[model samples]
Target chain A: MKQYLELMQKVLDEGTQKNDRTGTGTLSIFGHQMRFNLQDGFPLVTTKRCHLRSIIHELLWFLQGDTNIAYLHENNVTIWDEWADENGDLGPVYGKQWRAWPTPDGRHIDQITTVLNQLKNDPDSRRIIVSAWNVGELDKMALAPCHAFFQFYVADGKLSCQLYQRTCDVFLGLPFNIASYALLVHMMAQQCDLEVGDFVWTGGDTHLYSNHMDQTHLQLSREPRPLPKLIIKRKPESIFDYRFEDFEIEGYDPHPGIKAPVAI
Target chain B: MKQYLELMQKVLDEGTQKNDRTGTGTLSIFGHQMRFNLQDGFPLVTTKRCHLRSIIHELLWFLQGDTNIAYLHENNVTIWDEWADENGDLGPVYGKQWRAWPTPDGRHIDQITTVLNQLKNDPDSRRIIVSAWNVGELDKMALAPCHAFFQFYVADGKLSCQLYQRTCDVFLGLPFNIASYALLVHMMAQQCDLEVGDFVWTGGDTHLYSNHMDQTHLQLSREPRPLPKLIIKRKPESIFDYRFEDFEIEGYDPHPGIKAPVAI
Candidate 1:
């Protein structure tokens, strides 16, 4: 949360004011990176109380390889409701890309499974990567991936993950994104029997939308509380074998949530 | 090159010792980013003399969508020679993914062309991204992409590019990768009739191999000279039309090149 606040302060200090596709102007910086040592704790932003229910459900939905918003709707999650079509389809977004990225040879590659295999068999390989920015499939998707690309690394039996988030809405989305990936790392490390290392988040076009400016400043105004601990009640059978009840957040004291508008 | 040297120093001070796939150990960090205002000049390292010829030739080769080492060897650049098979093939590497990423629907998507159009038509769109981490085709590549994905942004009538490099050999590969992408930003700006902006480099598993330790320190000991300017002599018909002869480096005085071994 300290690093999170630091990044927010940075956007305020040196960001460029730019016109964005959302029609709301933004104070944006081109590139920024933050590192959260997972050994310390779960990287939930402590300045604002973030409910992990939606985050957990969404990540589970992604691992399920379901691009349709039906599951989210079933779980009372409306975050992706704005982008779904009448059929509740998101047209091969993160879930599809993660579980069934299509190859020219008509094979659907399971990137998550491949990553787990590599982590168990060849952890030192720098090529242990999972990318959701499948270039060929962007046109049909409801929205392009914001957390587009990510890579995993292993050293001394500790697993680390880095995500390349192309567009970060600093106030609303970044905290959620961080928690989602950090949780993914923990799950992967548990499956591989490795200790947690770091959740490295690198952002391109990190910005605070004009509508969220007041909320951003208000959150930054509060002192950052300690990062919360993520408790996994049980290890799932596989990465996709996760249930919402398996996750719990402990020691998560925070200021109140400052509501902000979604860019979409 | 000051930023380059600063990173090296930072690694020396706080980097964690980790073993890598190459059997060479490393002192590495998780995430880091550097910004070079192209208004300052080209980002080629001045502390240790760097040859831009190979970088230019390799980039041009990538744009041409050639995955074979034949073009590189023909141009007397052997940087990729180690990865090339008997047929000089690298098997759907950066070039292949850049020029024609394969789709499951039996179509090839030209990412380079798409980004060019975006820069021209919708510069404000945050989704102007080009990714070489084709997840479905990773098994075929001789070596997975390290400078895996990049995005382009336009602000104040100037175009900026940010690269997310998942793995980098700080001493041997970082400088070349920096120049290669910086050159790309310049070319893209030129083709789109926009001024040059910042070239931001973000690294995930940034490390200095144990073998390059001496060279890294030697280069850090020297004073960084003024940044050199890259002069593109002619604007070619297209991004893919430029040749090595069309580029030149002006006023790049520096300490002699320090030799370092590649990780293979």
Candidate 2:
């Protein structure tokens, strides 16, 4: 979690200030990278209280490739609440884009399925990627994607994943982002029979909105807790077969959860 | 270009050995970042002989969002040669995903245009990104994009860009990757009425192929020349209006061009 804190400090100390659409100015930096070795426990931020429930459900939804937000709301995950439409629809967001992105010919392509197949048949292939940044569909999205794309690499029987998040709200979103993706990597590794390797997080407009500066400072002042161990209750036969209760966390102790309003 | 060389050396020295889909093994690392200020001049590699002509045309074609390799081949750019189908089509590679990615509906999305608009209207928007890693179309693409996605940032009335390339053939591809996006940053800045800011290059599976180890060492041993200057002949009012003749490179000197066959 020092890596996460360091990023916040970097943006505050050296990032350039700029005005933005939310009427919230931001101190922004471009091209930052961080790595979390799964060998070390899960990369969940224990310095501040972070929820693992929403993160778990959200990841499951993505693996299921469901675009509409109904499933999420039903599961009590409101992390995406601000962006949902009247019917709680997110209209081809992460899950849809990752698994069932639509094509012009009225067909949907499942990138996850294809990637799994490629890993089995062509582990040496340089093309093992799953992306969600569909340019044509941007206008229809309730909110444009922030974690725009990601790729996987398998070497020495260990599988690793890297995500290119085009934008990041460091204080509020980054912890969940790290956990969600790390869990995804864990699942993929389990299904592929490879060791869960590193999770690399790359960001573009990584920022701390002006309003969050105080919160950022408070967070930085807090001592980091020992990284909590994420326990997967059951190892399902398939990536999509896991349920929410299937995850458990131990050794997590932190300050009370911080609350901040959404910029949008 | 020391940053570029350092990356090559580091990957070779510390990266893990892994077999890849191309039947060429790699020593790979995940999550690396480097930045080049466009104000300092174009980021062409002066450390080794690099071809600027192909980089320029390839960028022009990408901005045009063409999927066919005929345009690239006719212009003698072979970077994409190995991935093209017999018909010379890349099946909606970078260009299509960038300019005209299709959605479930009949709508078309142009990330470049959207990014331009975002920069002008919301300079601080973290979501000002252009991505080519279309999940739905990955299987169809001649090559799942290595330079998968990129984002733009504007601060102090200057526009900067960061690219996330999932896999890089460091010795061969990195120089062009840096210059291409730097040119993109410059062009976008010009259109947005902003000054050129920085070009940040980030990678996922940044590696040196097993076969290129010697070449990588040779490159490291060679003394680096002063960074070259890239001069755009005429500045266009819009990002899409620029042409090949609009770009020129002056004062690029290095060792003779090294030819290494791509492992694919």
Candidate 3:
């Protein structure tokens, strides 16, 4: 996770101070990218303890195409509580866009299913992309997607994924986003009967919120430990069939979890 | 230009041999990024004499919200001609998706106008994005957007743009894409009254077509020249109101053009 730490340090060293829509301000950089080879180890940030449980549940929820917060609450995760409307609805967020993007002809296109078929049939096709940043439906979403667009590729019979995040709260949201997408890669690779290749994270407005300056430095102070190994208990029947208990994080040694305020 | 050359060299050295949709095959790499600071110069490829005239006319046409090749033909640019149908229409391609993405509610969202508005009113906002990868309208497009989604950022009173290109033909299309986006950045900067900043390009399946290998090597053998300066003669009343004659490229000394086959 040196790549992750280096980005944090880069933000501190040279990131420009800028105001944001959240009104919290940020030390931000315009464009940056990082790559983590999944074969090395699971890229769960090692400098601080991250909740892998929420990552899994959130992903599973996305796979099931459930945008409401009910499924998350059932799994004891409230990361999206603030964004949910009454009756636990979150509009057409990631799940809706990923699994069933609305078409003009009163039909929904299942991007995930299409991508899966593409991966299985034509792995070399460069069009194997799943975009959650539905430009038409932005006003319908509870929040504009932060980790917006991602693409998948296969090389040497290994499946790799690259996520294009539009905005990242480096302190509060980035670690979770990384773990979520990396885990998704592992799941997709397993489903495709291929080895995990790499998870490349590219950020648009990547920044550490102004409120996180102290915690960001504190995180930089901690030495990054060995990245933990992710063990899947079983291969699910499909991408959506995995249970929370199926994932286990092995050999995760990390410093204490750093608490940071979420800019809502 | 070193950044562009470095990517080509890296692809040659470490890229995997992969089959592509266009059966010509390629030496492909999954994820790569390149940055060209617009303040330095226009990011036209110094290794080869490129057709900047085509790029300029094409961009103006996109701003015109045109999916037909009539405007391009009038400008004597035929890059998109092969992809057109009997009616010389490209369906809802980058132009339609950029200027007026249709909504399920029978409304058309002008992404370019919205982005320009956001750039001026809320420069620091992270949501200043324009997406051409309309999931619902992919079937309607003649060619799915290759240079798909792009975002704008403003900081230190300079405007920066980042493009996420889902597919790039490293030999042919990349140089055009780079110049096109950089040109957009310059136009946007001028319109918004800011200095030009960096243009960060992220690619998903970046590859050099098999047939272009010799051409690629020949180009890499040459030394990169000083990047050319792009001078727009006047700020158009709007983003759309610009003629090709208004744009001029100065100091673009380079090696002669390398001939390569179109993979299609």
Candidate 4:
């Protein structure tokens, strides 16, 4: 929790002002990293209230390899609404890249399944990675991946993940991202029968949007509450079998939500 | 330079022992980040003598999009010989991905040129990234890319690059990786007519081989000297136009080189 806050403070203190594609200028800094040990608690931001429902549904949607926003709409999650086309398609977004990355040889590689196998078979393997930054398909996607690449490591019977997010929206987007990945680690670790270690968040172009500065200050003025603990009620048969009902955030007492405009 | 040594000490102090693919076990730490300001001086390892010749030739080869080790050999650099096939081909590695990432639609994308253009036209764009972790092509590579994904950021008329390296051989490979990327930053800055910023390296599964412990400690015990400065003899017509003779490292007073067994 402090790590997240410190990053925000650092941006406020030393970030350089730059115009972004969203037309909302930002105070940006390049290359910042924060690590949250899952053994402590879930890395949900405590300064403001956050919704875990959308994160769970989004992750499940990505795992399902569904590019359209129909499932998100069915779950009443409007997060992807703005990015969808008339047919609710977001083109080849995170879902397609994560679950069915197309090869030039006419094959779709399921990266999640590959990681699972690596976790089970070659736990010591160094290339346990999933990349959503498909260089060839960037133009087709409705949005480029901000949290683009991730790698998993296994040592001492613990599973750890480090995410390399190319762009981070500190106020609104990042908290959800941190929680989403932390949940994924839990699910993966549960299926692999390993303990959870840490979820490290690394960012390039880490910034606070000029429009979100007020909300950032408001949230920063408030002291952070204790981080909430994530409890997965049941172990699914596989990572794909996870459901929204399977997750519970216990003891998540926090301040009221602060509203901020999305960059896009 | 201390940033480099501090990371080694961290791995030695808090690293966990884990058996690796090469059967040489390692004291591994999961995630680490280091930044070197190019204005401060070239970020070469002054604690031990590192060969810049190989790094320079290898980078030039990568820019040429030649995956075969023949180019490296012609330049008298054999670091990649261990990984080459009987035909001297390393398969579609960094060179191919950076210069010609193949699409399923029978088109190839030049990510380096794209970044170069973006730096000139839209310097503030956050999506300027080059990735070599082509998921579809990984099975065909001689060795999966260790320094897989990288992103560039421009602010205050300075160009900055961040690399997401999945696995780091802290003792042997990291210094070279750092210098290679830093040299890249300088070259890119010169080509784009922008000042150089920081070259930030973020690593996953950062480790020191158990066999390299003596060398790591020995190097750490030595005092760090003044960092060397990188000089480009002339402005390259393009990012790919530089020759090995055109570059020089000045005032590189350093300790003797440390030798350790290769993991492979």
Candidate 5:
């Protein structure tokens, strides 16, 4: 996870100060990218004891194409509580866009299924992309997607994915984002019977909230522990059939969890 | 540009062989990024002489939201001729998706106008993005978008743009892609009255056509000349009003253009 730490230090050292929509100022940089090879180990942040419980539920919820937070509440994940409406709906967010993007002709495009088919059949196709930045539906979403776009590539029987994130909360959200995508890669590879390649993360306005400086420095001070190895208890029937109980993180010795304020 | 030359060389050295949709094999790499600071100079390719005349017309056409190749033909730019249908239409491609993305409710979202609004009213906003990867409309197009999605960022009173290209033809199309986006950044900055910043390009499945190996090496072997300065002769009333004659490239001395086989 040195790559994670290196980005933090780079933001701290070279990031420019800018005001943000959340009213919390940020130390921001415009463009940045990082790559994590899944074969080495899971890309969970080692300098801080980060929990994957919420991320796992969130990803599962996303795959199921559920926009309502009721599923998350049933799983005891309250990370999205702040954004849900009285009916527990978060509008047509990630799940809605990923699973069923609405079209003008009263039809929906299932990006996930398309990705699966592309990987399975046309693995060499250059157009294997899933984008959540629906231009017309921005008004309907509770929150615009941060991990806005992604593409998958297959080479030498290895599946690699690249995510283009529009914004990154480096200290609070980045670690979880990394691990979540890495887990997705693992599942996709398992489903396609291919080896895991690289998970490339690209960011637009990557920044640290001004309020997170203390937590940032604290996490930076700790030496990174060895990344944990993610072990799947069973191969799922499909990408959507896997359960949270089917996963285990072994050898995850790390520093204590660092707390930071959420901007929104 | 050394950056352009370096990528060509890197693809030659490390890119893996992969079968492509064009039936032309390619040596491809999954993920790559390059940065061109607009303040330094125009990011036009100097190793092999690139004619920006077609690029200028194409960009102007895109901003007008024209999906037909008639406008391109009027300007004597036939690059998109191969992709056009019998009626010279390209269905809903970059121009349509950029200027007016249709919604299920019959509303058309103007992404370019939205971007301009965000840049002017909320320069610090992280959600300032324009996406051409309308999943619902991909089937209607002659070709799916290669330079699919893009985001804009502002910091220190300078505007920066990042393009996420799902596929890159490193030898032939990449040079044009880089300059076109760079030119857009310049136009966007001018419209918003902001200084230019960096144009970061991120690519997935970046590749060199198998047959273009000779051309790639020929371009890579040449010495890179100094980047030219792009002079926007006059600031148009709006982003939509820019003309081809209003632009000029100065100090663009380069080696002869190397012809490469088009994969399509």
Candidate 6:
């Protein structure tokens, strides 16, 4: 969590200004990487109040590979609200891209399933990857993926995951993104019967929006709370079988939740 | 270069055993990232006879964003030879995924140009990405992308690039991959009117194939040669406008080339 806060602070205090497609300017730095070992407790941000409930549900939804917003809305998660149409369809977003990415020939490839099998049978394979950047489906998606791609690695009988986020709204989104994927690693580890390993986060346009400067400053001023523990309630047999209620967060004490608007 | 050789040796001599997707087992590591500053020098592997000719041409073809392999063949580059069909088509490969990733509606998005503009206009925007993992066209290609995705960063009036390679054949392909992307960062920085920053290489299933163990040991036994200098002949105005002759590799003297078969 200190590493997370320090990154935000670096971008704010030392990062250089640059323009972007969202019409929101950014202060960016190149070639930054952060590692969070799940064994060191969950890498949830403690500098401010982060709702673990929403993060957990969002991850479950992604694992389900459901592109519609129905499940998210059912669980009171508003993160995907702006991106969904009236019918709650968001086309093939993260889940669909991960689980059942559509092919041009009327077939779908389940990267997650393939990866799990690869891990079980061929852990030494360098091709354990699951990508969500479906070029053909980008237009159909309510919004193109920000966490564009991710890959899994197995070493020393432990499973690790790294996410390549093309864009990140640092103030509002980064913490949730970190925890969500860390949880995903844990879930994948459990399913693969491997130990939890490192979660490497790499970003493209990782920045705090212009409007978030004040909130980011306020956040920087606050001392970080103790790192929170993420408790997975059930030992699910399969990666896809986990539900929203299967996760719990305990010992979380933090500053009030900060409000920020989406740039889009 | 010692670091590179050491890594190879470690993977061969002490790397943990694991199974892999290609049926060619590997000695694997989970999460690894390395950073090379372009301003310092090109990231060519000094220990081996790493060819920059094909590397440069391959990059040029990618910048053109052409999925077809005709451009590569025209330049007398055979790197993509093993992966192409009779028609010289690598369906929706790197170039297609980078420049004109097709969506379901027939509209195409050029992530490479988009990222360049994003770096120019909004350096702080975290969404700057160019992806080549088109889910819809995965089955149509001879091989899925191993260096699946990449992102850019701008800070301190300098631009940098990072690539998330889902897989790597460290003994053979990594040196070329490193130089190719490092050159890309330099070209990108030049295009954006920024200095060459750092190039970070992150791997998912980074491994040395079991079969390459003998070559790996032999290579590690040799002292690394002086790193070669890369000279781009001209600073092209656009990413797509570079010619094969525009790239020049000087001071690249090393051991004879080593042959390794593609795992697939």
lDDT of 1 at B115: 94
Cα-based lDDT at residue B58, candidate 5: 95
Model number with the top DockQ: 4
| Superior candidate under DockQ, 2 versus 3 | 3
Worst 10 residues of 2 chain B by lDDT: B255-264
Candidate 2 recovers a fraction of native contacts equal to: 0.87
Candidate 5 accuracy as lDDT: 0.91
What ranking of all candidate models by lDDT puts the best one first? 4, 5, 3, 1, 2, 6
Which ranges of candidate 2 are over 4 A from the true structure? A261-264, B69-88, B261-264
When summed lDDT is taken over every stretch of 10 residues in candidate 5 chain B, the lowest stretch is: B255-264
| Model 3 segments more than 4 A misplaced | none
TM-score for the B chain of model 6: 0.92
Between candidates 2 and 4, name the one with more favorable DockQ: 4
TM-score of chain B of each: 0.98, 0.94, 0.98, 0.98, 0.98, 0.92
lDDT: worst 10-residue window of model 4 chain B = B255-264
DockQ of 1: 0.77
Q: Ten-residue segment with the worst summed lDDT in candidate 4 chain A?
A: A255-264
lDDT of each: 0.88, 0.81, 0.90, 0.92, 0.91, 0.78
- Give the C-alpha miss distance for residue A175 in model 3, angstroms: 0.5
DockQ of each: 0.77, 0.68, 0.90, 0.92, 0.90, 0.52
After aligning candidate 6 to the native by TM-score, how far in Å is the CA of A145 from where it should be?
1.5
lDDT of 2 by residue, A1-264 (tens): 789999989998898877556578878787788888888888989778888898888888988997787888887788788888788888878788777777766777788888899778887666677877777666678878878777788777888888888878898888889998998888888889898888989888788888888888989998787788878778898887999998888888877777776555
- Kindly report which residue stretches of model 5 are placed more than 4 angstroms away from their true locations once superposed: none
Native contact fraction, candidates in order: 0.90, 0.87, 0.91, 0.96, 0.96, 0.79
lDDT of 4 by residue, A128-173 (tens): 9988999888889999999999999988889999999998888878
Q: TM-score of the B chain in model 2? A: 0.94
Q: Which ten residues in a row have the lowest lDDT in candidate 6 chain A?
A: A22-31
**Candidate 5's residue-wise lDDT over A28-61, tens digit each?**
9888998998888999998988888999999999
Among residues 3 or more apart in sequence or in different chains, the pairs in candidate 3 whose N, CA or C atoms overlap within 3 Å are none
